[PDB]
Ligand SMILES: Nc1ncnc2c1ncn2[C@@H]1O[C@H](COP(=O)(O)OP(=O)(O)O)[C@@H](O)[C@H]1O
Ligand SMILES: [Cl-]
């Protein structure tokens with residue numbers, strides 16, 4: 001079937017290419033972050049990295065809200081003020097909202113509408129589209145595309161993980177090449193291109209406070225995650241030399257409703273999972289900083305949108 005999903009996608013894109021479908025424009029600058037495949041690609045992390053670059057602007061992130069308990073357009077946080085449970089928001093928007101005390105977050109299937117409500121209520125100076133590469137109906141002033149090595153040899157859904165053919169790389173203004181710290185790769189296209197690394201430096205307790213890895217020594221952990229790809233987390237742990245006695249691989253966006261930790265055991269998971277387990281005392285998350293090659297170049301490129 002990957003050949004008529006593909007027909008549909010190609011058709012859709014041609015329509016947008018030729019100007020047969022409406023592209024709408026918000027009255028402030030819009031940066032899109034997205035990728036080409038299902039299965040995680042550093043999008044959420046990159047969006048948080050980006051919001052941080054723009055710390056001197058009023059920033060609003062526009063997200064779709066992936067499997068949440070709420071409908072329509074929803075304000076998740078107002079410049080840091082959380083306003084819904086993580087269930088109501090979707091885990092990614094909530095995580096962003098939580099780790100970015102200075103940013104607003106809006107969840108909306110129709111991103112343009114989300115932007116309008118945000119303008120009305122938050123007067124942001126810049127929008128970041130969380131996962132907005134395929135949402136061509138909303139105009140973006142800077143279209144950033146994340147690629148991981150794996151995408152390069154993947155194929156269209158349902159056969160493979162690609163939501164669109166690799167040729168659609170042409171729609172990007174800038175490419176970000178992710179997971180360099182675990183799957184390095186090069187990719188030259190003549191477009192502005194930036195390698196993204198994750199520096200795994202820190203450990204969080206379940207109240208989102210930094211703690212030394214000191215608790216991990218000469219202790220084997222039970223690790224788990226519910227991510228786009230649990231495999232890369234599992235590998236990061238091995239590369240870090242963290243002793244992992246067991247690994248539980250949960251579905252992306254897993255709700256942990258039936259999760260009950262065993263007494264005396266220590267659990268290691270990600271911030272994306274941890275938001276759903278706040279207060280469980282023996283559960284920790286591996287945390288990291290995002291670092292971009294040629295950050296200075298990315299900045300000049302980003303600030304062009306304000307002129
Ligand atoms: N190797 C990892 N180490 C720590 N946290 C991770 C790791 N991989 C993913 N995460 C968590 O999951 C979030 C990203 O979700 P994921 O499903 O990997 O991809 P995407 O952002 O493309 O949806 C990150 O912000 C981080 O909180
Ligand atoms: Cl990530």
Ligand SMILES: [Mg+2]
Pocket residue numbers: 040092228
């Ligand atoms: Mg995701």
